[PDB]
């Protein structure tokens, strides 16, 4: 049981590492794009 849970563990570490890799790509792009958004300008009618 310890060996079956052990080989379980490197696969779970590998799958969690892939989800980390996805998260670092999204975080990097969101931070870079969150300065180039065009701010909206509103003016009175009268």
């Amino acid at each position: 049981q310890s060996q079956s849970d052990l080989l379980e563990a490197q696969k779970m570490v590998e799958e969690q590492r892939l989800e980390i890799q996805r998260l670092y790509k999204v975080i990097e792009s969101l931070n870079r794009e969150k300065s180039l958004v065009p701010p909206v300008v509103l003016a009175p009618a009268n």
Binding site: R17, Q21, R22, K25, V26, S29, L30, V37, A43
Partner: protein
């Protein structure tokens, strides 16, 4: 005339005057200064003989003047840039001229043969072969990489035929790849050298000429044509010269580096002899993103017993410049698990624009970087690499991840292309992935049109590699001296085309044991037992095999069996040497330029002797010029689509996949579905704006004053038009392209069509499908302009005429499940909805729905599927078929609900 700004380019493509070394026609550049200074026929010319002189003079003009500033001074910088590429195109005109007649007169190098069987006579006589006893000066600076290669000196052009190496084990296939990345090294250098001379910043020892070489391919010979540097004052190896002074300044430091890996590792200390040399090599290492010495002098990746000439940078005395030679190891190699593959090379776009971590040169090059690269983009993918092999393993795993999650979903969401042989071989190359990694994309592709495009591309490549294995045999035996070489070349084509595509048993047996195993041992996917020939038997495979083999057929291949208001195209399946193309009609003269000149010199003074092959030409125009970079960086800061918001980017990460990176891309952002009239239907579905996605930019500052007082086209439109216009003129004066020239014009006319401008897109389209050849789906795309152009400016009758022509064209050249057909049917249904026919929009819009589920995203829906089901639901609503409208709209609700890659506005 209006059309002049694109017509004058393509007419200049059709007249690229064939020049010898002594001929200087023109009043603009080298022909207006160097004219009548270095004359002489071929008998007296040999050595020096312009070419290298003309090319390097124009390179000296572009670097001198870009130093000067001013608006009038930089206008003239624009001319000399096109004059430089016109001069390069003069080199390529003689490159195709020398090499094509080389194959006819001297087949496979050696004269003998059954052709010219009778001092060698004719135009064959003007070719002077060099062994290491004939012209030993030529043999030194230009030594063949392998032993079977022969080197011929004509005018001032060194023509290295590729034939492999028998003794050493190098096949002619593998030798063509080592010569290919030798070219890719020189193209890599040519951009960096141009930039290094361009910027101010950094008798000057190393002067770094423009590296020029062309890989012309006429019937699988791989002729490499290079200019001859001046060899009368025999060139000093700058490699030996730099380390000889270094051995007389720090003798012991050179010896310590020699015990390390080699005496050339001490060349990182060349500031002691010259400040200029060391800082110039620092720029080359920074731009190409390579450790230490930018070029691989001391260390190699191929085994030492195979004598392969390493990198040399020979400098002469006549013009005092060092030219780069034998750069086949400049790019970092790809390593799969620890076994090094020295034939395969990573691309320029991956090394210097994706993986910002520097990459080593070969493998045995010792890794030397003192933990300064802690965390950056891609952050080394952990695991802390320790030597050069582990860093290349990190690089190759990064390229696997980039082709997996950054190229597949970009292609899947339309965007690029990936549709018709060429631009599939271009979408891979410019995104940064080698073409040999296509097997990985086949397993991950979900949609049917992209899976069939990759399957067609791999099978068309594999039949080419069996063609190269067969000519390995035909040169292995000495049969070119028994039988006539031209009809033996032709009879291999007709035998191969009949054995791969046909309706008999011997083409199914040929697929099972030779063609599919060829795909498995190159692209690395086991497709034996699944890719039975009745899945891709359509002549799209015939068209992709047509381009990748360099053989052209006639228009008599495609007949038609109309049975009343249709065409129903077919191909006959006897293939004969008679069905091979004779270059006489206006449509195929612009595939073998100067057919009438190559005719007159290999016949008589020396019809079924030219038929078939055309040279595939792969010139070395630097991708760092002013015109090249201006159109490129405008295309990245003004993309086609950045999607409605940023919260949908987070939604696609939620219960979904990673994010896509697309890179700057000049040409090939084409087709429908991006900025055609189906881009308007796409924008209405996704919730964005179609022309110039975020706005409709007409000014340069947000002005409240102007809007309060308000209570000739886009600046992106005029800018990208005027940048792609001079981008077209540069590549046409280069000539030597054919297919990618048509790819510039069809991209240009899609952008003209985007911002109105119907008449210019009409004229640019009709040039494509009357004069340019049929080697891709370029004639399919050219009429594909016309149906969109008429659709904007009403013209309903020319729509119906144009539609009934391309329905049998697309059922035949792409099969019954096509991306072009499904988008065409959606445009017909959209036009039927606009003009309020109401009915007769359900029959076309239903064919969109039955196709879009399978052709793109079978995991669920698409914007084409949502636009189809919305068009059916609206039409059945206003025709009072209210019950059937309930099914159609509710089916769109259920399918689009639990599916990513569609924003919240769609659901």
């Amino acid at each position: 005339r209006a059309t002049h700004w694109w017509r004058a380019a393509l007419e200049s493509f059709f007249s690229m005057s064939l020049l010898s070394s002594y001929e200087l026609v023109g009043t603009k550049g080298a022909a207006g200064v160097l004219r009548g200074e270095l004359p002489g026929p071929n008998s007296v010319s040999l050595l020096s003989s312009n070419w290298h002189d003309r090319l390097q003079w124009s390179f000296r003009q572009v670097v001198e003047e870009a130093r000067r500033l001013g608006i009038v001074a930089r206008e003239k910088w624009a001319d000399k840039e096109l004059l430089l590429c016109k001069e390069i195109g003069y080199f390529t005109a003689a490159a195709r001229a020398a090499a094509v007649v080389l194959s006819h007169t001297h087949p496979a190098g050696d004269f003998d043969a059954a052709s010219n069987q009778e001092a060698k006579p004719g135009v064959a006589g003007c070719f002077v072969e060099v062994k290491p006893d004939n012209l030993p000066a030529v043999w030194r600076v230009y030594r063949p990489k392998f032993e079977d290669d022969k080197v011929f000196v004509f005018d001032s052009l060194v023509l290295t035929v590729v034939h492999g190496s028998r003794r050493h084990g190098v096949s002619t296939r593998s030798a063509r790849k080592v010569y290919a990345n030798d070219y890719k090294g020189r193209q890599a250098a040519a951009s960096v050298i141009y930039q290094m001379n361009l910027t101010a910043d950094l008798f000057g020892r190393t002067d770094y000429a423009l590296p020029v070489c062309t890989l012309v391919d006429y019937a699988g010979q791989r002729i490499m044509v290079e200019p001859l540097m001046p060899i009368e004052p025999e060139p000093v190896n700058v490699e030996k010269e730099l380390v000889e002074i270094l051995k007389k300044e720090m003798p012991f430091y050179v010896q310590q580096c020699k015990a390390r890996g080699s005496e050339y590792l001490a060349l990182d200390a060349v500031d002691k002899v010259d400040r200029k040399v060391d800082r110039k090599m620092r720029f080359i290492s920074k731009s190409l993103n390579i450790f230490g010495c930018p070029f691989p002098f001391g260390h190699s990746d191929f085994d030492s017993k195979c004598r392969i000439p390493r990198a040399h940078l020979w400098r002469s005395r006549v013009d005092q410049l060092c030219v780069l030679r034998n750069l086949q190891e400049l790019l970092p190699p790809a390593v799969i698990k620890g076994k090094v593959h020295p034939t395969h090379r990573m691309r320029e776009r991956f090394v210097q624009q994706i993986f910002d971590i520097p990459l080593p040169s070969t493998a045995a090059a010792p890794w030397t970087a003192p933990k300064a690269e802690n965390t950056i983009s891609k952050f080394l993918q952990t695991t802390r690499p320790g030597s050069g092999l582990e860093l290349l393993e990190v690089a190759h795993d990064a390229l696997v991840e980039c082709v997996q999650d950054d190229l597949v979903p970009t292609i899947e969401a339309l965007h690029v292309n990936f549709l018709d042989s060429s631009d599939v071989s271009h979408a891979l190359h410019e995104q940064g992935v080698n073409i040999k990694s296509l097997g990985l994309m086949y397993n991950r592709f979900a949609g049917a049109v992209f899976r069939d495009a990759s399957l067609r591309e791999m099978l068309a490549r594999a039949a080419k590699h069996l063609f190269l294995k067969q000519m390995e045999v035909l040169v292995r035996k000495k049969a070119y001296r028994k039988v006539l070489w031209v009809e033996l070349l032709q009879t291999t084509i007709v035998a191969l085309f009949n054995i791969v595509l046909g309706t008999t048993e011997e083409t199914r047996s040929f697929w099972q044991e030779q063609l599919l195993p060829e795909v498995a041992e190159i692209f690395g996917v086991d497709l034996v037992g699944t890719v039975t020939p009745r899945s891709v038997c359509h002549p799209s495979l015939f068209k992709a095999m047509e381009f990748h083999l360099g053989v052209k057929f006639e228009a008599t291949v495609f007949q038609k069996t109309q049975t009343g208001e249709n065409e129903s195209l077919f191909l006959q399946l006897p293939f004969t040497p008679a069905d091979l193309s004779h270059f006489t009609s206006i449509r195929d003269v612009a595939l073998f330029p100067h057919i009438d000149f190559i005719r007159n010199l290999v016949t008589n003074n020396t019809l079924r002797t030219f038929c078939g092959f055309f040279p595939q030409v792969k010139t070395v125009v630097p991708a760092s010029l002013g015109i090249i970079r201006t159109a490129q960086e405008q295309a990245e800061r003004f993309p086609v689509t950045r999607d409605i918001s940023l919260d949908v980017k987070i939604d696609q990460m939620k219960a979904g996949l990673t994010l896509t990176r697309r890179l700057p891309m000049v040409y090939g952002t084409a087709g429908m579905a991006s900025h055609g009239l189906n881009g308007a239907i796409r924008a209405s579905v996704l919730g964005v704006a179609y022309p110039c996605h975020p706005h409709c930019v007409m000014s340069l500052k947000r002005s409240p004053t102007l809007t309060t007082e308000a209570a000739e086209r886009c600046l992106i439109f005029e800018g990208f038009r005027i940048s792609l216009a001079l981008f077209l003129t540069l590549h046409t004066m280069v000539a030597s392209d054919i297919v990618k020239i048509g790819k510039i014009v069809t991209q240009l006319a899609y952008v003209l069509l985007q911002h109105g401008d119907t008449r210019q897109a009409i004229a640019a389209a009709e040039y494509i499908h009357t004069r340019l050849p049929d080697i891709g789906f370029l004639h399919g795309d050219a009429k594909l302009l016309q149906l969109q152009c008429r659709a904007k400016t009403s013209k309903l009758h020319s729509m119906v005429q144009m539609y009934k022509e391309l329905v049998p064209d697309f059922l035949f050249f792409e099969g019954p499940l096509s991306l072009r057909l499904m988008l065409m049917e959606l445009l017909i249904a959209a036009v039927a909805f606009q003009h309020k026919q109401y009915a007769a929009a359900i029959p076309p819009g239903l064919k969109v729905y039955h196709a879009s589920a399978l052709t793109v995203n079978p995991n669920g829906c698409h914007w084409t599927g949502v636009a189809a089901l919305r068009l059916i639901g609206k039409s059945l609503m206003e025709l009072r078929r209210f019950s059937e409208a309930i099914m159609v709209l509710e089916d769109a609700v259920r399918g689009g609900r639990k599916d990513p890659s569609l924003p919240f506005f769609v659901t």
